Design an enzyme around this catalytic site. Sequence first.
Site, PDB file in Angstrom:
ATOM      1  N   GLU A  70       0.791  -1.249   0.000  1.00  0.00           N
ATOM      2  CA  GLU A  70       0.000   0.000   0.000  1.00  0.00           C
ATOM      3  C   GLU A  70       0.818   1.291   0.000  1.00  0.00           C
ATOM      4  O   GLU A  70       0.330   2.344  -0.406  1.00  0.00           O
ATOM      5  CB  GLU A  70      -0.949   0.052   1.163  1.00  0.00           C
ATOM      6  CG  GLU A  70      -2.043  -1.042   1.188  1.00  0.00           C
ATOM      7  CD  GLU A  70      -2.930  -1.071  -0.028  1.00  0.00           C
ATOM      8  OE1 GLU A  70      -3.184  -0.041  -0.649  1.00  0.00           O
ATOM      9  OE2 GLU A  70      -3.411  -2.172  -0.337  1.00  0.00           O
TER      10      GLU A  70
ATOM     11  N   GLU B  98      -1.886   9.126   0.330  1.00  0.00           N
ATOM     12  CA  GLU B  98      -2.207   8.936  -1.059  1.00  0.00           C
ATOM     13  C   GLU B  98      -1.591  10.010  -1.941  1.00  0.00           C
ATOM     14  O   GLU B  98      -1.614  11.188  -1.657  1.00  0.00           O
ATOM     15  CB  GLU B  98      -3.750   8.879  -1.225  1.00  0.00           C
ATOM     16  CG  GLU B  98      -4.212   8.612  -2.630  1.00  0.00           C
ATOM     17  CD  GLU B  98      -5.693   8.465  -2.654  1.00  0.00           C
ATOM     18  OE1 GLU B  98      -6.294   8.310  -1.565  1.00  0.00           O
ATOM     19  OE2 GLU B  98      -6.261   8.467  -3.720  1.00  0.00           O
TER      20      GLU B  98
END
Length: 286
Positions: free
Chosen positions: A110, A132
């Site tokens: 991730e 992100e």
Amino acid sequence: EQCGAQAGGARCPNCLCCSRWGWCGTTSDFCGDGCQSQCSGCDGVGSIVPRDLFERLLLHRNDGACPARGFYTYEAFLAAAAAFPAFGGTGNTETRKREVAAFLGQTSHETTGGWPTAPDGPFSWGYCFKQEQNPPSDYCQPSPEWPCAPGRKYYGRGPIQLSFNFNYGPAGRAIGVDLLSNPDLVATDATVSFKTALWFWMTPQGNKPSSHDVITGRWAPSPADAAAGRAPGYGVITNIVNGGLECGHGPDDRVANRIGFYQRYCGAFGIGTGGNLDCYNQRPFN
């Protein structure tokens, strides 16, 4: 330093507890049950993953080019884990190491900064990011249960890239931190950051078991799971994390990246990965 009933009643310097057997220290071993002196004044996951191992697995995270550089500390990992004592403390030792390998494998994917020709290989570049990259949305889906805080954004943060108000809400409530109001904590406080990833790892949702239960062999498929090709192993954990996109349509580089991390880590822990590593042939849970 010795003390008490073989050291002439000597008390310990620096207000240290004298243990029942006559030695100086600050742990419960010295200060709890049996403590002879200065008891109130004047072995968890760290045993399975030592600092050296954590640092060698997460080898390049503190690279100058990794935006999260310096953020993800061993101390934050241990503090977060302390809140989820079943993590890396369920089953036998091999199983404990495998839980940690699997958790680290998935979360490394991730947050990976790797590339095929990276120093020490792509599977040493986990934990490079904490938020992100170029998020396309603030990911606010308003609900009465989890209203979006004005001025706040719910893009991916932390090792599981926790996303959406409706996940920050529950995660914060479980860990005792108001993440609906202050979602940025997942990117500014590494202990909170690791805690959200552990919360994800430990928590069943909908038709998904917890990753925890899968990796520790506490999950058995349902009929529906069986017809869907979902058998225990790391693959079903990939399905839990992101199966909607990555699973059920053959070999997929994202799934393979998750595998490569998991293999390297299992390697370093001296254990096998177990089988059913992929979700290439599984119906997504979602």
